[PDB]
Design a protein around this ligand. Sequence first.
Ligand SMILES: C[C@H](Nc1nc(N)nc(N)c1C#N)c1nc2cccc(Cl)c2c(=O)n1-c1ccccc1
Length: 815
Amino acid sequence: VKKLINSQISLLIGKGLHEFDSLRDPEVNDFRTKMRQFCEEAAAHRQQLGWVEWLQYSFPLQLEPNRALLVNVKFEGSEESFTFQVSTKDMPLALMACALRKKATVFRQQPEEYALQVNGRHEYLYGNYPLCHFQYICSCLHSGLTPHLTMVHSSSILAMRDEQSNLWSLEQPFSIELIEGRKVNAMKLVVQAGLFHGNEMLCKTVSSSEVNVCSEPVWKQRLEFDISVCDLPRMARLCFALYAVVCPIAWANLMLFDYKDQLKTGERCLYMWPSVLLNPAGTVRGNPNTESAAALVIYLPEVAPVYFPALEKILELLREILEYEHEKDLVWKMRHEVQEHFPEALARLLLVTKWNKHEDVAQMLYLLCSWPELPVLSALELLDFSFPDCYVGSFAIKSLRKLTDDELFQYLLQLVQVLKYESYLDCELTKFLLGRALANRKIGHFLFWHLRSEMHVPSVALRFGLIMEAYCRGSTHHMKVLMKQGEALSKLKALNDFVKVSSQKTTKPQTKEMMHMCMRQETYMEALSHLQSPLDPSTLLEEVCVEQCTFMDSKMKPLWIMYSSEEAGSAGNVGIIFKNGDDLRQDMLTLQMIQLMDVLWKQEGLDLRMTPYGCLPTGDRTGLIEVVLHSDTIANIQLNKSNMAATAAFNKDALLNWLKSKNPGEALDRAIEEFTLSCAGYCVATYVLGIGDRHSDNIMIRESGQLFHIDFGHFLGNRVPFILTYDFVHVIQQGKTNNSEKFERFRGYCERAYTILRRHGLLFLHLFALMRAAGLPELSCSKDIQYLKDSLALGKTEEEALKHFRVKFNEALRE
Ligand SMILES: C[C@H](Nc1nc(N)nc(N)c1C#N)c1nc2cccc(Cl)c2c(=O)n1-c1ccccc1
């Protein structure tokens, strides 16, 4: 009944829905109700879209950031096919007309009733775009594959849609009573408190008295703060730190206002979190491990039933050479000049605002309500924790609504991590993510995985769980599609555990042949087959190809899973790598950033022929990596095996020999330039991102000639110099030991790549600052965000970074 769905949702999201109920938290219950209605209502909107609108929902166009080609076309009811010559400049429509006409005149005697499906993928060609704007077509013009498409009539598209349906009156100091605490180790105990707005201190911190390493220590000590109850900003949070003195122990935070803006009065038991001293960015909800978490007991002094003032009441209440406090005062003084003449400097203005004074806040808020929308780039900055105010938060979201689905997809990883900054469950960001998610199935797909992958983390398990639940209410059908993916990943985990055990006790070929027998069990064949890929919902993983499955004899023994589809031919032979035991968030970020470089470069004419292959954490130290087909490690090739076509007289010739064995005759020259472009992209990418520990085992090359990096795990230093491998130069110089014309064009590719990136440098800084929310160990400080200082030399001009890049480039040809 409705129980079945609840059951399925509990299984999918990784948490029983009953566990939400058992909290009897009215904030939790209001979220679920309000968001369910919101999400069910979008679902209602979806069920009645035009068939082309539904195409846009479920299969958003995959577009690239004249000269004719072969295309293969068939219809849905018949396996009869027609091969056409068309131009890369032709619209899908023209192709559909040539398809309809040749059908008409073979069955004996309208294109607007059709769309073109890519064979074996959840991808479609439609809209008024030349064919060469479609990613699948571009991937065929480079692979030399022939595009195979299927004429799908509007009637069976609608069949798909339908089957997928379902008070400033308070003078006194604000003060706390610190009653007592309880859990321990090991000396003397102190409780440091603190009033914060974001990570701006609302006032001076106050420590408690030194008390003995008693367990259940006691204080009753009233703590009064240097700020009045009427001057607490809406988003004020009180932060505690409990430590030992002759060593940190725990921290815990909370909002002084509830989620209904009612200022908090009464007793609070604060279930604390373990430590590294005050941690304002930390979550405002208590440690769920109540059986063993230290708890701090406090009392919140009553003051009368007061609510934070409504917005109406709030509202009724040389400058250039900046783009020091005397400086800070000029900006606030000249704040009207900001709005009307420097609207995008809003961030800087908000940072000089006095958040501990309600009149200053009301003034700023009044300006904020008249403030014109900002560019996406400005808005990305405003989402950071250093802009905690809810109205600012909303303004930021409002400025983000013009995000295209392509950009939103690029930034989605960061928007999700920002959720960990929120103070309340119901928030504009959550509502925005959900809306976008319900309107674009690809967003929804990855929204889900970003949330599901962290459910093992107790500080976000609740929020993320609720969000996935609401989204499931918004698509009962996608939930089942998603369950299917989790069932496959559950089986891959079981299978991987067996391989870990078996390979320690027998040989690889024995483990492999029993990996195969495990896979051939019916529950495994069923679970592992006919699923959308979590790496890319548009990629369909049909028949699992057991005989080509294997595993790496390395480390975590990751699995190699191959698929084939008898309806895709070309685009159906694909593989995924399942890895359990490594943290993959790092790799995902890095590949995201490289993909964004690829976009920035490409949307300026420069195609460095990158390979941004998929990488998706799906669970605790668990995820998928997309297999890049027809590729090999530098290591395997430089191994210079006997017998092979690439066997060389000199080690430096192995790579170039390998390429020529893969690209005979004329074909070699394109492989060389591909190697060359891709080389320059990754050299610049790895230099800017600070990816070290680069070697022949983590660099690969495609038979096309394309070089790409894998297994990143580091970046930002956690300081790296530009890398130039002599064996690469040798390929670049087409083998000749002097070839300045080929070598200097390569030096050209690097510098332009570098300068393009240097222009959108702020974008990178904004995204990485947001990423700090993720708690990756390699991105924890200002010093990390600093490293992106030099790489991009954003302090300098023109380029007066001019010549940073010489030295690093000219140093790099040490090797
Ligand atoms: C290193 C390589 N990594 C990738 N290989 C491609 N093709 N695409 C990727 N995205 C990545 C990654 N990451 C790789 N990864 C594996 C992962 C799991 C299981 C196996 Cl059995 C392998 C494996 O054999 N190789 C390998 C392949 C060609 C030569 C030497 C070793």
